[PDB]
Design a binder for this molecule. Structure first.
Ligand code: GTP
Ligand code: K
Ligand code: K
Ligand code: K
Ligand code: MG
Ligand code: MG
Ligand code: MG
Ligand code: MG
Ligand code: MG
Ligand code: MG
Ligand code: MG
Ligand code: MG
Ligand code: MG
Ligand code: MG
Ligand code: MG
Ligand code: MG
Ligand code: MG
Ligand code: MG
Ligand code: MG
Ligand code: MG
Ligand code: MG
Ligand code: MG
Ligand code: MG
Ligand code: MG
Ligand code: MG
Ligand code: MG
Ligand code: MG
Ligand code: MG
Ligand code: MG
Ligand code: MG
Ligand code: MG
Ligand code: MG
Ligand code: MG
Ligand code: MG
Ligand code: MG
Ligand code: MG
Ligand code: MG
Ligand code: MG
Lengths: 129, 386, 63, 130
RNA sequence: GCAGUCAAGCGUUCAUAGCGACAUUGCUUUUUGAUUCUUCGAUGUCGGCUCUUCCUAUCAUACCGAAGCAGAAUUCGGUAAGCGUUGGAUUGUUCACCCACUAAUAGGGAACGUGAGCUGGGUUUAGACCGUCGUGAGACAGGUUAGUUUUACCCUACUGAUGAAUGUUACCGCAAUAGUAAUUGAACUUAGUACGAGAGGAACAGUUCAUUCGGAUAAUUGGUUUUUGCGGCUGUCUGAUCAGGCAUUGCCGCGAAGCUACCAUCCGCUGGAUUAUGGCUGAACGCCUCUAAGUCAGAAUCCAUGCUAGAACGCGGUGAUUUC
RNA sequence: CUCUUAAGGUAGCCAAAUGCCUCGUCAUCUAAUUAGUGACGCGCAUGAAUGGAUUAACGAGAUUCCCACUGUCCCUAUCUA
RNA sequence: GUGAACAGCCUCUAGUUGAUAGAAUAAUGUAGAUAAGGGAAGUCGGCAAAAUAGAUCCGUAACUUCGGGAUAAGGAUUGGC
RNA sequence: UUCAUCUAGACAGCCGGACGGUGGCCAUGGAAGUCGGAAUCCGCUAAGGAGUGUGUAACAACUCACCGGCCGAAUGAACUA
């Protein structure tokens, strides 16, 4: 589904909320598919599905856990074609466990692998990378 | 009481002891299983690690999300001048293991290989093999009988070959002598192959081919005495730790009342013999073939030597084997490449690479230009020259 | 493959070399080295930095 | 989901030849026909909309799988058509499935059709009024 | 705490798929009791962190047997400790509870492993406050606050490193022995197929990745700056300039080399014998029977292939071996 | 309505550095809180110069949260004396 | 001299050049630092470290014993000629 | 060790029959040997239970006790240590 991407969003990272669902940021609390290792923080990368809370945003989006999908990383990562790239900020979009977005639009670009992995994020995205 | 949190062991106990290798040349502890129907051919080769670079090639991997498009891959380049056959060793099977019955050397040995048999070459009298060379006085009657014993016996036949290291930019000047097993049927023909090849050179084209998976056997880069944190990857102790934190906190329970072999402890790191398997050759380039670093898609007249030369090695002027990834050992170090011990069929092997571009920019910095022609074409006229 | 152009200094970028930066406005900036990347992040002017091809073109250097 | 939950009407236009209009045991005039086609749901949980569909229609296209034969719902849905006095026409579907999966060589396919029609005709025979 | 025997019954019928009362036989020493045998010229007293090993009463993974096993899921059990068994909120805590990921978040020992390994949050000196008790000094498995964690250079153990002797020296080898390593998941396809009324929903083979671990390596990217390499800046000094000194590396930007990062890249092998188990022939016991003789396949098992070290008192081959 | 005292805790305040049960109950704070705060009070065993309550300012006093900040950590690496 | 300044830094008079030294630059230390992405997820506990910092101008809350809080918070500028 | 079958044919093996009154009485929505209480009978009999199980909504249909056909000499059961 996806090649390994340098993890830049450990548990506790707060990224920008990229959709128009009314949230201003996402606070990562877990990562789907993350491994187990003593003392090792679960960390997210481009295109990864995480569990997140809303720290700033519309009041009914706050105080509850919801799936999110990382659309911008801002941590340098290496493609197979040798390109080390990163975005200006960390950004994700609120989505259901099935990967369908809660919002209806994307602000900013979206990673290639994220668009490949999630068609709904790709469909709601504008320009990619 | 129990550890209270399970975690995998730090380090691999099968690579013990973590001591210095007894020689700068790693020993080939296993050769490919002999198939008595194939022709006689070397199962290994001797080269020297020159350095690393990058290439571009189309990825041929059906079922991959990224099939049929371009990948950038690191590759290690090993200078592999042809090895000179100077001897033949026979091994007979015994209930105590393999035993060398006898060894038959070539008539004339170059000073390069003779230097291996002396620690002080400058003040020596170079008497080595002078009485042995007399064994070829009229017909080599002792020699042909010695070879006949190898044919009558010695179920395993190995050739004694040495590197042509004066052809490398190394200041070593002393060749590395090694035994390479001759695979192929008709042991008598093995001795015939070796005897015919005395004083003769064997090129890397006869051992390796494009896309082949080979084994890298070399002594890793030495790092001296090392603490437990980097030697084994053990967790760093907190900043609050008294008497230092780059240590292992508990080196053992009260009972057994001894430090156990499985506990990470400080000592020498690196300079170990490693045998890393399944490295794919991407090039078998020829030293005399100008434009070594060119591909069917570039055609630019440039050798494999990077602009300014391989860092810490020099310029490559001989046959070189480019393997994918990295191999044990540092630059300038003797390495031996051997055949794979099994037939690997997993679509990573059998995958036929065709290079699109080879990086020839300077490794001495953030290299911007592949060739001196490109540097002039970019910057134009300078004040010093050009 | 296809050789790109450093967005700050104009140097040719070969496959695997340098870094890529996507701004919030989705603009792409390719840097051939950490020097050009750091100068861009420092917000120096390519017209004003004396070794960039854009500076040389503005000052009629080389031509 | 992959299922049918409703009964939606669709209108179809069908031109034919003169030679088969002669092969009609019904008073007709012309060469063109108009079809009002309903796609009933197969599930028993939606077995009321098929009753609505049957009342609004006069013919029934009974699609039967050659693999599974006559199922419980084919039993049920055809029964209600016969209760409404709907004339069914039966089509045997998934013959491609039997020809790549079951590898029926020469006669097994004919016998499956034979058994299918016999089982279908049993249903219409016992639930048809005179 | 764990495991058995009998089976009145539960389980729609049906003691034993799964359970199982009244009874009864045991095992274990991570519970806590009982005792006071060792230690009071002193074994450093909780918990956490770190790290190794071991046990199996096995949570997951491997292969299986049974089901009230249609599929999926699940339950009981067997061979099995090879390999994993987490990140956090609160609390010194062990324990507990919740959030969440995960294939799983199994239980334990090793002087209730581990303080000349750390820490000192707690307990458990001396200071201090409160509540209760006491006339009082003071007492509190009552609460709260502050409160010095000393020494290895000795022997052994372990990690590494030399080294006399076997005629000398040099090169190329063998491998007894010791260790050993890989682990797991996801996606596509099979296939919306087997099965099932339907809902649902596999599995073998194949492909691409990923998790944890391991070993290397620096082509690229990032870090590192005493390259004090270049440039800039401040204060001062060398009359000014140029060039520089000092500011404990004066500071700032870039910075090659080396080192180094799942923050970077590459690689991590396949044959046999077996366990459970399923079977073949075939008696015992004219039948039957995987078992008694014999025998087939078969597990993350074991042994090998492979990788590491090379017995410094294991060995082989080979070259030269002091004109004085 | 009783038993009973010298008087039977008044104004206030509280799971408070004082509450065992207790990690009390409700609310808020968090994804999750034996922590914090606001409430309630038959309060083992709160309470009025053995001072009660509240207090601006002050505090190398104890505690909780937020922004910023960072190698405390993920996950360690490098350099200098 | 810089500088608000007996602050820190450099220099003039004066004084000293006195601490056992030489060679390399392993581990682990002591002291000084840096570190991509994240930002307390470490830990009993933000311990330690980092971040802020001078001067000019704008602006400055709750509360208050009206005296303060207050440099609140939050901002903009600074060289040379 | 004890008790049983046994050339008038034991056990095992394979094959045949396993009836009629009668769907015994009563209950049951249905109960016909086989969800239940009770009755545990007669006739034909070499022999068949008011039934050994499977099974049906209830029938049915197989199956078993029971008796025979083939072979011809031993066999079975319950206990003891
Ligand atoms: N191989 C094969 N598959 C078929 C054939 N006909 C139908 N199918 C399968 O049957 C499924 C159901 O058919 P659809 O027509 O899509 O829908 P439907 O039959 O109305 O099912 P419902 O809507 O639930 O009633 C399809 O997804 C097909 O995959 C056939 O002829 N051959
Ligand atoms: K004592
Ligand atoms: K570097
Ligand atoms: K100066
Ligand atoms: Mg931890
Ligand atoms: Mg454990
Ligand atoms: Mg300390
Ligand atoms: Mg370089
Ligand atoms: Mg760099
Ligand atoms: Mg339909
Ligand atoms: Mg002592
Ligand atoms: Mg002791
Ligand atoms: Mg067991
Ligand atoms: Mg202890
Ligand atoms: Mg100790
Ligand atoms: Mg101690
Ligand atoms: Mg304390
Ligand atoms: Mg008192
Ligand atoms: Mg490493
Ligand atoms: Mg001076
Ligand atoms: Mg059989
Ligand atoms: Mg047997
Ligand atoms: Mg030896
Ligand atoms: Mg009161
Ligand atoms: Mg109270
Ligand atoms: Mg309170
Ligand atoms: Mg907290
Ligand atoms: Mg009081
Ligand atoms: Mg002044
Ligand atoms: Mg950082
Ligand atoms: Mg940063
Ligand atoms: Mg932040
Ligand atoms: Mg914490
Ligand atoms: Mg913690
Ligand atoms: Mg501090
Ligand atoms: Mg201010
Ligand atoms: Mg204030
Ligand atoms: Mg019945």
């Amino acid at each position: 589904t996806k090649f390994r991407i340098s993890l830049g969003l450990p548990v506790g990272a707060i990224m920008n909320c990229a959709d128009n669902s009314g949230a201003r940021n996402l606070y990562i609390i877990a990562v789907k598919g993350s491994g187990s290792r003593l003392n090792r923080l679960p960390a997210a990368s481009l295109g990864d599905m995480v569990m997140a809370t809303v720290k700033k945003g519309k009041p009914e989006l706050r105080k509850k856990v919801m799936p999110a999908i990382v659309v911008r990383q801002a941590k340098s990562w290496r493609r197979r074609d040798g390109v080390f790239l990163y975005f200006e900020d960390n950004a994700g979009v609120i989505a259901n466990p099935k990967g369908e977005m809660k919002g209806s639009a994307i602000t900013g670009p979206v990673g290639k692998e994220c668009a490949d992995l999630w068609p709904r994020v790709a469909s709601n995205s504008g320009v990619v990378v | 009481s129990h550890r209270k949190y399970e975690a995998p062991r730090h380090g691999h106990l099968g690579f013990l002891p973590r001591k210095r290798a007894a020689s700068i040349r790693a020993r080939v502890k296993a050769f490919p299983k002999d198939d008595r129907s194939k022709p006689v051919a070397l199962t290994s080769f001797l080269g020297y690690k020159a350095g690393m670079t990058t290439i571009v090639r189309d990825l041929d991997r059906p079922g991959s999300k990224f099939h049929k498009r371009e990948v950038v891959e690191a590759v290690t380049v090993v200078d592999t001048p042809p090895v000179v056959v100077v001897g033949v060793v026979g091994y007979v099977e015994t209930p105590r293991g393999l035993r060398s019955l006898t060894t038959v050397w070539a008539e004339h040995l170059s000073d390069e290989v003779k230097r291996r048999f002396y620690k002080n070459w400058y003040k020596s009298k170079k008497k080595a093999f002078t009485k042995y060379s007399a064994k070829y006085a009229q017909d080599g009657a002792g020699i042909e009988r010695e070879l006949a014993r190898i044919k009558k016996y010695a179920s395993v036949v190995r050739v004694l070959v040495h590197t042509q290291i004066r052809k490398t930019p190394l200041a070593q000047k002393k060749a590395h002598l090694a035994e390479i097993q001759l695979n192929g049927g008709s042991i008598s023909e093995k001795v015939d192959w070796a005897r015919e090849h005395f004083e003769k050179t064997v090129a890397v084209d006869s051992v390796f081919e494009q896309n082949e998976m080979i084994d890298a056997i070399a002594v890793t880069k030495g790092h001296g005495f090392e603490g437990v944190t980097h030697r084994w990857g053990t967790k760093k102790l907190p900043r609050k730790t008294h008497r230092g934190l780059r240590k292992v906190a508990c080196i053992g329970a009260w009972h057994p009342a001894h430090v156990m072999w499985s506990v990470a402890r400080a000592g020498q790191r690196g300079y170990h013999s490693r045998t890393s398997i399944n490295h794919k050759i991407y090039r078998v380039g020829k030293g005399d073939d100008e434009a070594n670093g060119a591909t069917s898609f570039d055609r630019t007249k440039k050798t494999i030597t990077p602009m300014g030369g391989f860092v810490h090695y020099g310029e490559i002027k001989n046959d070189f084997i480019m393997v994918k990834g990295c191999i044990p050992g540092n630059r300038k170090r003797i390495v031996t490449l051997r055949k794979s011990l099994y037939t690997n069929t997993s679509r990573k092997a059998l995958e036929e690479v065709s290079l699109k571009w080879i990086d020839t920019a300077s490794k001495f910095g953030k290299g911007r230009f592949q060739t001196p022609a490109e540097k002039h074409a970019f910057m134009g006229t300078l004040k010093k020259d050009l | 493959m296809k050789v790109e152009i450093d967005s700050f200094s104009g140097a040719k970028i070969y496959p695997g070399r340098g870094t890529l930066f996507v701004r919030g406005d989705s603009k792409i900036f390719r840097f051939q080295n950490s020097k050009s990347a750091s100068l861009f992040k420092q917000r120096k002017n390519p017209r004003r930095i004396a070794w960039t091809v854009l500076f040389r073109k503005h000052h009629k250097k080389g031509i | 989901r992959g299922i049918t939950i409703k009964s939606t009407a669709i209108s179809l236009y069908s031109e034919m030849s003169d030679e088969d209009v002669k092969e009609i045991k019904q008073k007709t005039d012309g060469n063109s026909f108009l079809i009002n086609l309903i796609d009933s749901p197969g599930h028993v949980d939606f077995s009321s909309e098929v009753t609505a569909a049957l009342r609004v229609t006069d013919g029934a296209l009974v699609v039967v799988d050659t693999i599974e034969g006559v199922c419980v719902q084919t039993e049920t849905v055809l029964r209600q058509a016969l209760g409404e006095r709907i004339k069914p026409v039966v089509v045997i579907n998934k013959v491609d499935r039997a020809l790549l999966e079951l590898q029926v060589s020469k006669e097994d396919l004919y016998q499956t059709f034979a058994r299918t029609v016999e089982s279908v005709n049993v249903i219409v025979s016992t639930y048809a009024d005179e």
